[PDB]
Write a structure and sequence with these properties.
Membrane topology (chains A, B, C, D): Multi-pass membrane protein
Largest sheet of chain A: 2 strands, antiparallel
Oligomer: homotetramer
InterPro entries (chains A, B, C, D): Aquaporin-like, Aquaporin_transptr, MIP, MIP_CS
Distance between the termini of chain A: 17 Å
CATH architecture of chain A: Up-down Bundle
Number of domains of chain A: 1
Order of helices and strands of chain A: HHHHHHEEHHHH
Organism (chains A, B, C, D): Spinacia oleracea (Spinach)
Protein name (chains A, B, C, D): Aquaporin
Main location (chains A, B, C, D): membrane
Shape of chain A: globular
Chain lengths: 243, 243, 243, 243
């Protein structure tokens, strides 16, 4: 695998993929984290969208954002997804790094904006950040993240279009709706355990704005968890020999 | 951009686009505002559809109504959407104004009908109208509306069909389901802040029937917010150079 | 319009359309009414699927059942839908009557089965039947039903395929998912008012098994309401000149 | 029907179908059972995803997993589905048995993993296992399972693609989303009665890990129920003469 292919010299489009990933990840974090705070700060019992509403916000936004960005960047919005595709040789090392930089920067800004708009409740209620919940230990959280990310990266490899790519690249287009639903499904099982990471940029962004020691102690789980899940899904895609 | 193109002299279809936008916006306001009142007036705790149900009503109706009207008018049902497309040169100034007139008239009637059917609870519970919620100030509400409308108008520009248009026009057909989901997603994050406007006609219609001074004080947010969000999404569509 | 066309002499397929409508309507009533009783009989607060879950059951089943029956019968599962299409000249008088007989018989059986399986709670909690709720009067209920059925029959006329028909007929295939969502959307607004009819067979079936005088007093609303809504949607389809 | 066809001598693909069914069923049980435990163990009233969230987890995962596995194995993830298709002569006896072995093994592992990750709450709250709920007797549970499985297997026969098959087989591809929704719809009606089986491997897996005498007493319902539902749906598919 070289570090880069001729398609990274199409600098106009490469720039635009990066921007697309950047903005999408912002949008992602803003809408989802704002749904979290608004639910946690509600005084009325059942006066909110509930944990259900919060799972839809994550799944729904991924659907919407992959829909919008699949023909521009490939619609990753998530370093573990970019990592998995990189393992499967669909992304060069150079586009992979440019993508995770964009995704993490975008993630920080979105959580940023959510704090700007409601600082009080943002800090009081966890700041949207991921961590090990009471009653589970680290290895459980890690297993949960490995397996949840496997479910998302396995759906992504089935959602790849074998013939169509993003503008001026060989990066596959992705069917937005199954991927969105997998995100949704994994939240309904994972919110009680880690809040659900399965997206290192989404976990990184909330750690950066929330800035708590508890949160940062846990943060390794949400890189290693997902990256391992991603790698096991790549291994599986290649072994059920199907790209 | 001229004020009008030869397709506005196809008066039969132009008339029918306008009617289509008018009725859709009625339908929109009636179903969504009626879901709001029915939830707010319920005596049982969790005896309602909840804020979740209320977000589906907005997202779902947009999906249904864009589905029905995309080949007739282009399926805008929302002046900020018509404004955005106008900025992007997909709509002439003349069809744009005819559309927002239709959308606002339709919006007033739908909220009208919801009051006709349940006057007591309609007035008692906020009348479905948008405003700045306790604990947020005006600039926050405005930011929330800018960004929420950006998410909807960004999804709309990705949902445009580059080859197919509404009857007897060059106005693009739109993929109803991503647009509906974006409406849904933006509510789950915005209902606690402004109730969610992102649609000047939807905010205008509830202000007109509810008629409260509090509500009218706030009403500028729900024109300026969305129109700015719309303009920033147009700017972005044109810069990620993709119509 | 003759009373019947040569396609009603294809007796094999005509028989099978009727059976298809019959069974679908059973399935419809069984799953939806069983979701109602199971929710109403739950002792735990928020221990149920909620009014939200109940709206999905109606919308979801319509989606599933139109999906299954659209190429066999046209996927009506609802006399107001069959009535509307009949008005628009897509169904002969003879197939229309055969369809509503099948739909009402099927509806009675499904509610039948729900009573068979849980007689205690079935009778105690309203028996799934439609009626005017406390705090609304008859004209409101009727308006609600007119307009809710308009929303469903308007979505159905946009969901008609202009080129593809059900086996051995000129009855149009229907896009199941927008129609299902319209059913869903109309429930979120109507459950507090009448429980939502918008389907005379669904209202007739629950009236027949529940058998209460209150319920039967109201039952005219759920024929006249929907049939009027259906007729206004046909009138509109023909005037926005679009079959 | 012979016991096997030349397509079971394509051992590479046959092996891979089996693995695909195996892993999918694991994924299925892990995500769904983990959503159950996380909901049942929550201390806050409405602090969970609710019975609604739990129904989405089952429906959603089936959608996601049929999406991923339809072109590899045919996307059954459920012995009653494999049984039904076997009755309809779409699956040989030999692939049918290999599939249910894979499905049951996979089911056991998924519930396995859910216990590994949260042993305390897993055992305390029912272990995700199916059984007859208080207030219903065995024949009711059985009827509920017959009919619920009929709804799923009837949707599956309408979701079969008549022209496209899984890799190196004559096993039909299936439209994932109607099948997923039917699973969802059947839960909203059945969760109060048996928890919803309609999948012998899903019931078998939770019986094996939970290991309770109550649960095992009931377990016959969740084989006989679904297999009968499946057989009645096959009979119906063949009689509404439509494969």
């Amino acid at each position: 695998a070289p570090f880069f292919d001729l398609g990274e010299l199409k600098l106009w489009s490469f720039w635009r993929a990066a921007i697309a990933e950047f903005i999408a990840t912002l949008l992602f974090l803003y809408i989802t984290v704002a749904t979290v705070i608004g639910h946690s700060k509600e005084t009325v019992v059942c006066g909110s969208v509930g944990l259900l509403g919060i799972a839809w916000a994550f799944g729904g936004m991924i659907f919407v954002l992959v829909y919008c960005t699949a023909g521009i960047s490939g619609g990753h919005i998530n370093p573990a997804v970019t990592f998995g595709l990189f393992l499967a040789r669909k992304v060069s090392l150079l586009r992979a790094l440019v993508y995770m930089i964009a995704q993490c920067l975008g993630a920080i800004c979105g959580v940023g904006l959510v704090k700007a708009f409601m600082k009080g409740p943002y800090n009081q209620f966890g700041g949207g950040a991921n961590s090990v919940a009471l009653g589970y230990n680290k290895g459980t959280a890690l297993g949960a993240e490995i397996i949840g990310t496997f479910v998302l990266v396995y759906t992504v490899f089935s959602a790849t279009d074998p013939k169509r790519s993003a503008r001026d690249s060989h990066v596959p287009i992705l069917a937005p709706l199954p991927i969105g639903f997998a995100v949704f499904m994994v939240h309904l099982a994972t919110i009680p355990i880690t809040g659900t990471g399965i997206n290192p940029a989404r976990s990184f962004g909330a750690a950066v704005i929330f800035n708590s020691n508890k949160v940062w102690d846990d943060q390794w789980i949400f890189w290693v968890g997902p990256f391992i899940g991603a790698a096991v899904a790549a291994a599986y895609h290649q072994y059920v020999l199907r790209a």
